Amino acid sequence: DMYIERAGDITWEKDAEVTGNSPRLDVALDESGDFSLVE
Amino acid sequence: GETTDGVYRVMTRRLLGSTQVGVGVMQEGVFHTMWHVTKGAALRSGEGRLDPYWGDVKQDLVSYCGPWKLDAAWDGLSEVQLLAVPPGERAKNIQTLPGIFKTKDGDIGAVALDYPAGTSGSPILDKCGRVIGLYGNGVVIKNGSYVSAITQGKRE
Numbered sequence A: 001d002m003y004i005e006r007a008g009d010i011t012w013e014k015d016a017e018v019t020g021n022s023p024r025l026d027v028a029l030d031e032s033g034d035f036s037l038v039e
Numbered sequence B: 001g002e003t004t005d006g007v008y009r010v011m012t013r014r015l016l017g018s019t020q021v022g023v024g025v026m027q028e029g030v031f032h033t034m035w036h037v038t039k040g041a042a043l044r045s046g047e048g049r050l051d052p053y054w055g056d057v058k059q060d061l062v063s064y065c066g067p068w069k070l071d072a073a074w075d076g077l078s079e080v081q082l083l084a085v086p087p088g089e090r091a092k093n094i095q096t097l098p099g100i101f102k103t104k105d106g107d108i109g110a111v112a113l114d115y116p117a118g119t120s121g122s123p124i125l126d127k128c129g130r131v132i133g134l135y136g137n138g139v140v141i142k143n144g145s146y147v148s149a150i151t152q153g154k155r156e
Ligand SMILES: CN(C)Cc1cc(CNc2cc(Cl)cc(C(=O)NC(C)(C)CO)c2)ccc1O
Pocket: A032, A033, A034, A035, B036, B060, B114, B115, B116, B117, B118, B119, B120, B135, B136, B137, B138, B140, B144, B145, B146, B148
């Protein structure tokens, strides 16, 4: 039996940690909502 | 119970201790999360109950108490922020330039940040603070790195 707990406001924070790359990936989406890497 | 706008944890007592199975967004009195977080189950908020209203397994989305309300879209250019809510850790804005999922039905923005499954449903924000989608449906590639679609629903 699941319950929710408030974690924060939804705001853009000026000077947040900046990280991660931006890959362009070929993918498929199946009926079950599963994404798969084509290449 | 709590109907305030904001980002929430979704918790269960069905596993060891209190476990975080994911995250979602309360906006205009509707709760927004990923289908694979709740599998469409009812949610407690205080002695408040939230009942499912809309959902689709293929989109991996679900709304509670009302129709899907989040309608903003990635512009395809600008940096975004993942408002990560990791299990047992404070909400933390992470800023990134999305990549792309190329699909036979068109292209979707993708966020390449490595958080554990319980972060599923954390919101992705534009610079006006609007939610452009939820993080937690995607692919694991190469070394075990995660890339999530920017998953957005449709407002009527
Ligand atoms: C239609 N289904 C496919 C939806 C679906 C989604 C999940 C969640 N998947 C997930 C989410 C996140 Cl935010 C992270 C990770 C992960 O593996 N991260 C690391 C860093 C690689 C290791 O911790 C996985 C689960 C079962 C499901 O059916």
